[PDB]
């Protein structure tokens, strides 16, 4: 969902 | 005889530790290598309780009254720093969900929603405005490469998260250079809790 | 009797050193405070020769053959790292003249000539293009605030300096939103020596 | 002649  | 043996043991171990500290201090940054960065992180996690436990030992076996008081203050110093790190890191992680929130280097994060996913990047300098540029379908925001995004599908809002506050910035100006090229500016309008 | 005294003295000094290392490792960055940054630099400058001297001592007084060989390799490692730092720092200083060239965190520098002076800022990510935006007479390049500059007096060229090569980027696109507001894009065209 | 900020 959250990529960094 | 036995006197010299321990000297060798202590000096050997300390020499290895000193080299490790030199390496993490010289190369331990994400802009250099993530590998040495993770090593530096492991060192810091180990370093907090070691400093506190060491100062507690010196407080129990002091040289004099002044050493006792300084040892107590230094031990409380280690505790306060660990507590502070945990508080701000957890707050930023609850706000963003990114692992970048555990990086002592950055206390500002920029969240950009690309399509149905969110990409987070640490922000170098806090500001009230953020500039986005798309060239031939590739998007770069605030001078940082963010990835592949069509100029027509740019998000209306973008968020900046700090340990204490979350800020929202809405699009204001939109200029289209080409079919899939253009420039946009986001300005802040509201503060969060 | 004297046995316990040395324990007390050594443990006290080590406790102070451990606390100092925790502080520079946690707060020693320009994005947090310049004060701990200078302390961290002082620690690193001192750390190179101490590590080398420690390993040389263990090579003269080793536990066995393996300790001696490892001590030699670690000593050469300390020496090589110091030489590498000095070479890369001096090269960037000859190219830019900025003290930012002595920061192991950043090996890319952006030089912008505002009027008759030059302002240098470390660059987070290398790129072939640089975006500049001026609002009401204040200039911000690559998401970094650069200062006060009139939109009419924007530089034609801007340079990016690495330890080995210097790159020049000239203005391509120029759009004026207001009297002293606009956006410009610089792209690279030449490589240096 | 050079300001590093
Ligand atoms: C582009 C070059 C990058 C590589 C640079 C390093 C190349 C290898 O360096 C060679 C220097 O090695 C010196 C090691 O010295 C250790 C001394 O060993 C002492 C052991 O003596 C035992 C006596 O019984
Ligand atoms: C940009 C990379 C440049 C790399 C340059 C490498 C230079 C490193 O040189 C290291 C020299 O090592 C010599 C130190 O080792 C000698 C050991 O001390 C002598 C004692 O020998 C053992 C006594 O029993």
For residues C163 and C166, give the distance between their C-alpha atoms in angstroms, rounded to a whole number: 8
The verdict on C143 and C123 lying in the same domain is yes
Return the residues preceding each gap in chain D, C–N over 2.5 A, or none: none
Tell me, yes or no, whether B88 and B123 share the same domain.
no
Structural domain ending residue among the three candidates B84, B102, B120: B102
At least 3 CB pairs under 8 A between chains B and C: yes
Report the SS3 class of residue C180: coil
**DSSP result, B101-165:** GG-TT-S-EEEEEETTEEEEEE-SS--SEEEEEEETTEEEETTEEEEE--GGG--SEEEEE-SS-
CA dihedral B110→A4→B88→B161, nearest 10 degrees, is 20
Pairing of strands D2-4, C117-122: parallel
Q: Is B126 within 8 Å of chain C by CB? A: no
In this structure, the answer to whether residues B131 and B54 fall within a common structural domain is no
CB neighbours of residue C164 within 10 Å: 12
Of all protein residues, the one whose alpha carbon is nearest to atom 22 of ligand 2 is: C59
Spatial CB neighbours of B180, under 8 Å, sequence gap ≥ 6? B134, B136, B137, B150, B151, B152
Count of beta carbons in the 10 Å neighbourhood of residue B184: 22
> What DSSP string runs through B5-74?
HHHHHHHHHHHHHHHHHHHHHHH-STTT-HHHHHHHHHHHHHHHHHHHHHHHHHHHS-SSHHHHHHHHHH
Nearest to B28 by CA among D1, C112, C24: C24
Does C121 lie in the same domain as C90? no
- Do residues B8 and B85 both lie within one domain? yes
Q: Is B67 buried (19+), middle (13-18) or exposed (0-12) by CB count in 10 A?
A: middle
| Chain C 33-62, residues with CB within 8 Å of chain B CB atoms | 40, 43-44, 47-48, 50-51, 54-55, 57-58, 61-62
Of the candidates C51, C88, C125, the residue with the CA atom closest to the CA atom of residue B23: C51
Q: Which of C174, C167, C172, C168 is nearest to C186 (CA)?
A: C172
B78 beta partners: none
* Residues from chain D contacting residue C98 (CB–CB below 8 Å): 2, 4
Q: Ligand 2 in contact with C84 (CB < 6 A)?
A: yes
> Do B13 and B66 share a domain, yes or no?
yes
Go through chain A and tell me how many residues it has.
4
Residues C31, C47, single domain; the answer is yes
Same domain, C77 and C133: no
The pair phi, psi for residue C51, each rounded to 5°, is -60, -45
- Asked if B touches D (at least 3 Cβ pairs < 8 angstroms), the answer reads no
Q: How distant is the alpha carbon of residue C45 from its chain centre?
A: 14
The candidate with the shortest Cα–Cα distance to C41, out of C93, C98, C104, C109, is C104
Nearest CA to B26 out of C125, C19, C34, C51 is that of C51
Phi-psi region of B147 (alpha: psi -120 to 50; beta: other; left: phi over 0): left
Question: Experimental method used, please?
Answer: X-ray
Subunits adjacent to chain D (3 or more Cβ pairs under 8 Å): C
Are C124 and C87 in the same domain?
no
Domain count, chain C: 2
Q: In A, which residues are within 8 Å of B117 by CB distance? A: 1-3
Residues of B with CB under 8 A from a CB of A: 96-100, 117-121
How many other C-beta atoms lie within 10 A of the C-beta of residue C63? 15
Question: From residue C58, how far is each of B8, B16, B19, C51, C148 by CA, in Å?
Answer: 7, 10, 13, 11, 56
d(CA C134, CA C138): 5
Count how many residues are written for chain D: 5
Question: Which of C6-14's residues contact partners 24+ apart within 8 Å by CB, and which partners?
Answer: C7/B61, C8/B58, C8/B61, C8/B62, C8/B63, C8/B67, C9/B63, C11/B54, C11/B57, C11/B58, C11/B61, C12/B58, C12/B63, C12/B67, C12/B71, C14/B54
C-alpha span between C36 and B46 (Å, rounded): 20
Question: Does C116 contact D3 at a Cβ distance shorter than 8 Å?
Answer: no
How far is the C-alpha of B139 from the C-alpha of B118, rounded, in Å? 14
Residue of D nearest to C110 (CA): D4
Nearest CA to ligand 1 atom 3: C80
Last residue of a domain, one of B39, B73, B102: B102
Facing B15 at nearest CB: one of C51, C104, C141:
C51
Between B and C, how many CB-CB pairs are < 8 A? 171
- Residues C67, C140, single domain; the answer is no
Q: How many CA atoms lie within 13 A of B58 on its CB side?
A: 31
Indicate whether B8 and B86 sit together in one domain.
yes
As a whole number of angstroms, the distance between CA C5 and CA C3 comes to: 6
Dist. CA C115–CA B75, nearest whole Å: 52
State the nearest Cα–Cα gap between D2 and chain C, in angstroms: 5
- Structural domain including C164 reads 109-191
* Same domain flag for C15 and C98: yes
Contact B96 A1 (CB under 8 A): no
CA proximity to C108, closest of C25, C188, C28, C27: C188
Most D CBs within 10 Å: which of C95, C109, C116, C120, as the mutation test of the D interface? C120
3-state secondary structure C51-115: HHHHHHHHHHCCCCHHHHHHHHHHHHHHHHHHHHHHHHHHHHHHHHCCHHHHCCCCCCEEEEEEC
Choose the final residue of a domain: B71, B86, B102. Answer: B102
Q: C21, B173: Cβ pair inside 8 Å?
A: no
- φ, ψ of residue C15 in degrees (nearest 5): -65, -40
CA distances from C189 to B37, B155, C186 (A): 34, 32, 10
Cα distances from C175 to residues B119, C16, C28, C135, C160, in angstroms, run: 29, 57, 40, 12, 23
């Amino acid at each position: 969902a959250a990529a960094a | 005889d036995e006197v010299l043996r321990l000297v060798k043991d202590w000096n050997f171990t300390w020499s290895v530790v000193f080299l490790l500290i030199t390496i993490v201090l010289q190369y331990g940054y994400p802009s250099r290598s993530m590998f040495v960065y993770v090593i530096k992180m492991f060192v810091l996690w180990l370093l907090w309780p070691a400093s506190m436990a060491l100062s507690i030992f010196c407080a129990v076996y002091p040289i004099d009254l002044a050493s006792q008081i300084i040892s107590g203050i230094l031990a409380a110093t280690s505790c306060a720093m660990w507590i502070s790190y945990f508080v701000q890191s957890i707050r930023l992680f609850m706000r963003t969900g990114s692992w970048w929130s555990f990086n002592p280097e950055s206390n500002c994060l920029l969240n950009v929603p690309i399509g149905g996913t969110t990409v987070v990047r640490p922000l170098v300098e806090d500001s009230t405005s953020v500039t986005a540029v798309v060239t031939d379908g590739y998007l770069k925001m605030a001078g940082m490469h963010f990835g592949a995004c069509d100029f027509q599908r740019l998000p209306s809002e973008v968020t900046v998260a700090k340990p204490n506050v979350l800020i929202a910035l809405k699009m204001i100006k939109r200029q289209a250079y080409g079919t899939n090229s253009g420039v946009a500016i986001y300005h802040r309008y509201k503060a969060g809790n």
